[PDB]
Write a protein that binds this ligand. Structure first.
Ligand SMILES: *[C@@H]1O[C@H](CO)[C@@H](O[C@@H]2O[C@H](CO)[C@@H](O[C@H]3O[C@H](CO[C@H]4O[C@H](CO)[C@@H](O)[C@H](O[C@H]5O[C@H](CO)[C@@H](O)[C@H](O)[C@@H]5O)[C@@H]4O)[C@@H](O)[C@H](O[C@H]4O[C@H](CO)[C@@H](O)[C@H](O)[C@@H]4O)[C@@H]3O)[C@H](O)[C@H]2NC(C)=O)[C@H](O)[C@H]1NC(C)=O
Ligand SMILES: *[C@@H]1O[C@H](CO)[C@@H](O[C@@H]2O[C@H](CO)[C@@H](O)[C@H](O)[C@H]2NC(C)=O)[C@H](O)[C@H]1NC(C)=O
Ligand SMILES: *[C@@H]1O[C@H](CO)[C@@H](O[C@@H]2O[C@H](CO)[C@@H](O)[C@H](O)[C@H]2NC(C)=O)[C@H](O)[C@H]1NC(C)=O
Ligand SMILES: *[C@@H]1O[C@H](CO)[C@@H](O[C@@H]2O[C@H](CO)[C@@H](O)[C@H](O)[C@H]2NC(C)=O)[C@H](O)[C@H]1NC(C)=O
Ligand SMILES: *[C@@H]1O[C@H](CO)[C@@H](O[C@@H]2O[C@H](CO)[C@@H](O)[C@H](O)[C@H]2NC(C)=O)[C@H](O)[C@H]1NC(C)=O
Ligand code: NAG
Ligand code: NAG
Ligand code: NAG
Ligand code: NAG
Ligand code: NAG
Ligand code: NAG
Ligand code: NAG
Ligand code: NAG
Ligand code: NAG
Ligand code: NAG
Ligand code: NAG
Ligand code: NAG
Lengths: 285, 149, 149, 100, 99, 100
């Protein structure tokens, strides 16, 4: 369903059908959390009335993290979980931590964004590698149940979301580094005019630019890829995987840049009447 | 055409302030700044035979300092555009895309002189701007005409 | 051939040719324009920013990620000339408004003009400096109480 | 008026150098025509607004000429023209873009 | 013409050069880090590597390995410097002298 | 205004007879619409300029009416209104588009 090229056949336990949750936290953009710096530009001691793809003030999340022990449902690959990429997504990802001889191992789930996920069109995969984040925009040949594996104390299965040992056509390939000891990671992914844009941050702040990528097509689907590990749950040291997403919308925000260029305040110009007054006069007072 | 009309109204206002005022050749505003214990020093620029006509009064200086982009501020704004001289101003980016402001045909020190002469014409012989009589006599007759004895 | 990613990067240099003080094209990280560069030290770029902007939407500075050096960008000069032309003459008189005559004789015109001076309005070519004289009617009014006769 | 040089008006970009370096000249004219029409529309609107401001400026200049001639240069038997009535006299002074 | 003051256009500035920067996506190939390898195979069991999805040029290559000749075939030597191929497949081995 | 009928405005020609005798009715609409838009923009600009000229004409008409009422049909205690002041009298005469 994700990819047609079949990879595995065992452990297709089918009966479990749990749903994505709904959080108890509205996204609040008063202190920058929910916004981003404008590509690779600097602004000093100003207010900017910026139109871009932002979240909506007062909206809730959906957890899409899936942890299997050894079993893989086909309802885990359904439009309950295979969602759509209309304008974009703002994401809040929990950074799970394991310890083998008191050595830190970070882990969370990877993410695929594409249209039909075959070897005739470009899909984007963002994948963690324990303090290293590798982004690859290529023509992968996706598995039927694309899934991942943990690497500290691993699972029984083999990590197989593609078998494409030929180095296929890649439009983008890069590596980035982040904090292993971090608590959350925030991610912006959107698309506009046939170009893909991506932003990330690890400390709670506005998210910083990762990359822009000119394609020419329109991505339509994304998927959080399910992980399979050894021991993370409550009988263990109480680790829990989370991946919260909220959609994006083309809307207007008012940003405040101090003299070193840090976003100190933002205003969603349609939350109230005072926000409309603030945004049409381009001032916070 | 709009700029021609602005030049014409500037010349008309300058014409009305000077239409029939006669002054003494022995005046000197460094010596004669007042009459009748009424002080006119803050209204007068300079005039005479040894001053140098580039002067405004006290009131005119107090008003021109609180407004930056006057006819002189525009000129010294555009003088700084070759190099920016800090980094940047809006007026140099405006003028480099074809939007300039021209100076008027009469400087504002000239209109300062024309209002100096309209002031001094009412305080000394022959009192041209006071209907021939001296200043405090004119005030007396004007208050008399309201119902005051 | 001619379809793919394994590209030869040479016929698309990326040298250290940040030549300040002159007007040059630029294609900086997607953004195109022309401008004048000037080397500086800046303290505000992070490891993901390479262009400086203002709230109007103009690009005003940048940081070359080949040399870790910061620069500021200024607009290049564009303007007109004011030609005061009297009938049956052979050449007009020229005013470059708000420009020093050193800048005009160096960076604009290298053509033979033996007469020039630096007036309050700019640089005057093909005319004599005779501001001590004065006139009461003029066809060629230049602004701020000056004229061409 | 200067901020009108950043609108696209239905074209792919607002930069002329971007259009002339990314398209082919039969397809570039279709984009430059939209920018030309939008910028000429902006200039026509500015020129009409200047033509309407100059009429108010001329009305004020004529009344200032009249107050110079009949409250400063002389005094007139009108009531409530200068001042408020019980008006005695009037002086004049030069001001940025006018007269005090 | 009559007497007047006219606003004549002058040519004002011409740009001297070009500047360029693009912060590339893909990673280089480092062909010369393979062509200067130590263990050179013999003409029975020559190697081959497929350098694809990266960036390269020629001048740093052909001055970083001690070239003695570089011919071409079905190609022009300056058509490398522009274009964008799809992969490159370098096969090296040592040479026995009399053959 | 008559010289606006020779502009092309982006079309292939400025003649309507040439567009209608060389193209097809789906293809000639694209060319006739550009001429229509350019000529209607020309007419709108002319009408805006006429509407702004009429206000200066009416201000001059009001001052001529007032000079007839108070320098010609009678004589006024205003100083520096007509003439120069030392003004004695004033006559009126008919002129093309006005009054002497
Ligand atoms: C880009 O992506 C596309 C995917 O969209 C890739 O294309 C895929 O390539 C696969 C090859 O790696 C291929 O898998 C299978 O193809 C073989 C050909 O199958 C035909 O011929 C058989 C002759 O024996 C015939 O039996 C078979 O019929 C079977 O299937 C049909 C349904 O398709 C049934 O109705 C029949 O009843 C029967 O069951 C086909 O007609 C096939 O032989 C292979 O299977 C054998 O090998 C397996 C591994 O060894 C083994 O597990 C299996 O049991 C068999 O022994 C092989 O699995 C995909 O079919 C093909 N997909 C499409 C849509 O074309 C493409 O390769 C990729 N490009 C690149 C460059 O990567
Ligand atoms: C990004 O970093 C990863 C490691 O986190 C690199 O992957 C390694 O690549 C080498 C050579 O290809 C292999 O020997 C290792 O086994 C790989 N490690 C893993 C965990 O896969 C990758 O090459 C880097 N990519 C870039 C573009 O820097
Ligand atoms: C040829 O390509 C080489 C590729 O190595 C270029 O050298 C690189 O320049 C960048 C820019 O600073 C450095 O980051 C790399 O480290 C350089 N490579 C090496 C091996 O040091 C070189 O500039 C190119 N030259 C020409 C003429 O095209
Ligand atoms: C410009 O500054 C960057 C720092 O942002 C330098 O990048 C560092 O380079 C060293 C050695 O090359 C690495 O060990 C660091 O990890 C790099 N830092 C980062 C953040 O990547 C870069 O070398 C500097 N360039 C010059 C020419 O001085
Ligand atoms: C030269 O080529 C050989 C391949 O034959 C490279 O050898 C590899 O060396 C690493 C060393 O850690 C081994 O782990 C690999 O197994 C070797 N590869 C093979 C195929 O045997 C060697 O690294 C190359 N030289 C350089 C400088 O890269
Ligand atoms: C997928 O492939 C495996 C072996 O490659 C085979 O056993 C299995 O039946 C295939 N499934 C389908 C649906 O073709
Ligand atoms: C299996 O699904 C049921 C209902 O869909 C749910 O209550 C249960 O928690 C699931 N099993 C596990 C192990 O979560
Ligand atoms: C902050 O912005 C104001 C806005 O004009 C400016 O005056 C001030 O200089 C800025 N602060 C610094 C430190 O530059
Ligand atoms: C931890 O220590 C044990 C024995 O001391 C060893 O077997 C194991 O591999 C170690 N783990 C790591 C991650 O080094
Ligand atoms: C995973 O791979 C290993 C070797 O690569 C193999 O021994 C094992 O059987 C594989 N497991 C599955 C479930 O395929
Ligand atoms: C982030 O990394 C820095 C140094 O790498 C470290 O000092 C800091 O504690 C890290 N953040 C957290 C939340 O641990
Ligand atoms: C983890 O959860 C278990 C189950 O409630 C609990 O007993 C244990 O104390 C927890 N760990 C910590 C460090 O609190
Ligand atoms: C009267 O005249 C003298 C000299 O002529 C003068 O100093 C004085 O101020 C005048 N006083 C009044 C009340 O006019
Ligand atoms: C013009 O530049 C000079 C020199 O930097 C400066 O002193 C002056 O204040 C500037 N004037 C304006 C109007 O910016
Ligand atoms: C001066 O100009 C007039 C144009 O009205 C021309 O007829 C006349 O010949 C000119 N005189 C000379 C000496 O060229
Ligand atoms: C003007 O020319 C001089 C040399 O004659 C040169 O040094 C200077 O950089 C030029 N200025 C500009 C702005 O091009
Ligand atoms: C122009 O002439 C005046 C007076 O003759 C003199 O003061 C001034 O310095 C002269 N300026 C130049 C540039 O010659």
């Amino acid at each position: 369903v994700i990819g047609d090229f079949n990879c595995t056949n065992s452990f297709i336990n089918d009966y479990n059908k749990t749903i994505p949750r709904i959080s108890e936290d509205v996204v609040d953009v008063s202190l920058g959390l929910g916004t981003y710096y404008v590509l690779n530009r600097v602004y000093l001691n100003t207010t900017l009335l910026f139109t871009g793809y932002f979240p909506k003030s007062g909206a809730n999340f959906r957890d899409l993290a899936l942890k299997g022990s050894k079993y893989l449902s086909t309802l885990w690959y359904k439009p309950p979980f295979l969602s759509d990429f209309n304008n974009g997504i703002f994401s809040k990802v929990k950074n799970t931590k394991l310890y083998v001889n008191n050595t830190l191992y970070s882990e969370f789930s990877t993410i695929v964004i594409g249209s039909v996920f075959v070897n005739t069109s470009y899909t984007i995969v963002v994948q963690p590698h324990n303090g290293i984040l590798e982004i690859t925009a290529c023509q992968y040949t996706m598995c039927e149940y694309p899934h991942t594996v943990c690497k500290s104390k691993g699972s029984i299965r083999n990590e197989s979301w593609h078998i494409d040992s030929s180095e296929p056509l890649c439009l983008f390939k890069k590596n980035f580094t982040y904090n292993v000891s971090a608590d959350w990671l925030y991610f912006h992914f959107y698309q506009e005019r046939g170009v893909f844009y991506a932003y990330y941050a690890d400390v709670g702040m506005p998210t910083t630019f990762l990359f822009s990528l000119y394609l020419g097509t329109i991505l339509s689907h994304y998927y959080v890829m399910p992980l399979t590990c050894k021991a993370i749950s409550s009988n263990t040291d109480n680790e829990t995987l989370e991946y919260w997403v909220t959609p994006l919308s083309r809307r207007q925000y008012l940003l405040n840049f101090d003299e070193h260029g840090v976003i100190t305040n933002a205003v969603d110009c349609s939350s109230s009447f005072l926000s409309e007054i603030q945004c049409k006069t381009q001032s916070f007072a | 055409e709009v700029n021609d009309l602005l030049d014409i109204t500037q010349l008309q206002v300058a014409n009305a302030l000077m239409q029939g005022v006669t002054l003494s050749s022995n005046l000197n505003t460094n010596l004669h700044s007042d009459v009748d214990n009424i002080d006119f020093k803050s209204l007068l620029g300079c005039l005479g035979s040894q001053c140098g006509s580039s002067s405004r009064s006290l009131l005119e200086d107090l008003l021109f300092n609180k407004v930056k982009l006057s006819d002189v501020g525009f000129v010294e704004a555009y003088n700084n555009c070759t190099g920016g001289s800090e980094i940047r101003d809006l007026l140099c980016v405006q003028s480099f895309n074809g939007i300039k402001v021209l100076p008027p045909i009469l400087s504002e020190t000239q209109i300062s002189g024309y209002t100096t002469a309209a002031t001094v014409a009412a305080m000394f012989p022959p009192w041209s701007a006071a209907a021939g009589v001296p200043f405090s006599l004119n005030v007396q007759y004007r208050i008399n005409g309201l119902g005051v004895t | 051939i001619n379809s793919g990613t394994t590209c030869s990067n040479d016929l698309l240099y990326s040298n250290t040719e940040v030549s300040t003080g002159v007007c040059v094209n630029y294609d900086l990280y997607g953004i195109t324009g022309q401008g004048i560069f000037k080397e500086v030290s800046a303290a505000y770029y992070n490891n993901w920013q390479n262009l400086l902007y203002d709230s109007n939407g103009n690009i005003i500075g940048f940081k070359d990620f080949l040399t870790n050096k910061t620069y500021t960008i200024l607009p290049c000069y564009s303007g007109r000339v004011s030609a005061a032309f009297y009938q049956n003459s052979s050449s007009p008189a020229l005013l470059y408004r708000n420009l020093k005559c050193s800048y005009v004789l160096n960076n604009i015109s290298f053509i033979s003009q033996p007469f020039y001076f630096d007036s309050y309005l700019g640089c005057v070519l093909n005319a004599v400096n005779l501001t001590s004289y004065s006139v009461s009617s003029c066809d060629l009014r230049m602004g701020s109480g000056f004229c061409i006769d | 008026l200067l901020q009108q040089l950043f609108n696209k008006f239905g074209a792919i970009s607002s930069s002329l150098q971007e259009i002339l370096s990314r398209l082919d000249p039969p397809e570039a004219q279709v984009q430059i025509d939209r920018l030309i029409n939008g910028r000429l529309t902006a200039l026509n609107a500015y020129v009409s607004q200047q033509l309407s401001d100059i009429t108010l400026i001329k009305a004020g200049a004529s009344r200032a000429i009249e107050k110079v001639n009949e409250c400063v240069k002389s005094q007139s038997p009108r009531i409530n023209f200068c001042g408020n009535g019980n008006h005695i006299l009037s002086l004049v002074q030069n001001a940025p873009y006018g007269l005090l | 013409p009559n007497t007047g003051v006219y606003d004549l256009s002058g040519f004002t500035v011409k740009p001297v050069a070009t500047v360029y920067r693009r912060i590339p996506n893909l990673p280089d190939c480092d062909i010369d880090n393979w062509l200067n390898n130590v263990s050179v195979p013999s003409p029975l069991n020559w190697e081959r590597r497929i350098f694809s999805n990266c960036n390269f040029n020629l001048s740093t290559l052909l001055r970083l390995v001690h070239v003695d000749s570089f011919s071409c075939n079905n190609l022009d030597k300056s058509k490398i410097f522009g274009s964008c191929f799809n992969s490159i497949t370098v096969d090296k081995f040592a040479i026995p002298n009399r053959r």
